[PDB]
Swiss-Prot record:
The modification Phosphoserine is found at residue 90. This is PH-interacting protein. It is found in: Nucleus. Expressed in myeloma and epidermoid carcinoma cell lines. Coiled coil: none annotated. The chain holds residues 1316 to 1434 of 1821 of the full protein. It comes from the Eukaryota. Residues 1-106 form the Bromo domain. Interacts with IRS1 and IRS2. Interacts (via bromo domain) with acetylated lysine residues on histone H1.4, histone H3 and H4 (in vitro).
């Protein structure tokens, strides 16, 4: 019922994500010189360095907000991909599975702690 515990849990999950080779395309903002049409398709860029910086700045109130931004990383990859078989997209799907497997307890524990707080 620790309603702050999510933040360090998300820090250590981001650490694992940064160690994963599948995160390499997503660690920093998509390079617009490499992908000159990126902003014609993607309205809101997102990447794991921006998520970590937002967390570390104290600019997430909840792990749901962090989860929305991480899911945006993956939806951007799916929207930008020219193929469901593309390499960088395929890395997104594995990393998404890894993230969802790990974030589920963080969300559950936070929402439980907050329900207890408001009981
Ligand atoms: O340039 C990138 N990464 C920046 C480096 C500094 C970390 N991109 C990753 C996100 N992108 C996609 O999700 C995608 C899907 C299919 C294809 Cl191809 O690209 C665009 C390419």
């Amino acid at each position: 019922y620790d309603i702050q515990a999510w933040k360090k849990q998300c820090e250590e999950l981001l650490n694992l994500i940064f160690q994963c080779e599948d995160s390499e395309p997503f660690r920093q903002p998509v390079d617009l010189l490499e992908y000159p049409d990126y902003r014609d398709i993607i309205d809101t860029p997102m990447d794991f360095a921006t998520v970590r910086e937002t967390l570390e700045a104290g600019n997430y109130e909840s792990p749901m907000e962090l989860c929305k931004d991480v899911r945006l990383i993956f939806s951007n990859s799916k929207a930008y991909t020219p193929s469901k078989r593309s390499r960088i997209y395929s890395m997104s799907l594995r990393l998404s599975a890894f993230f969802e497997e790990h974030i589920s307890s963080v969300l559950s524990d936070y929402k439980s702690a907050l329900r207890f707080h408001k009981r």
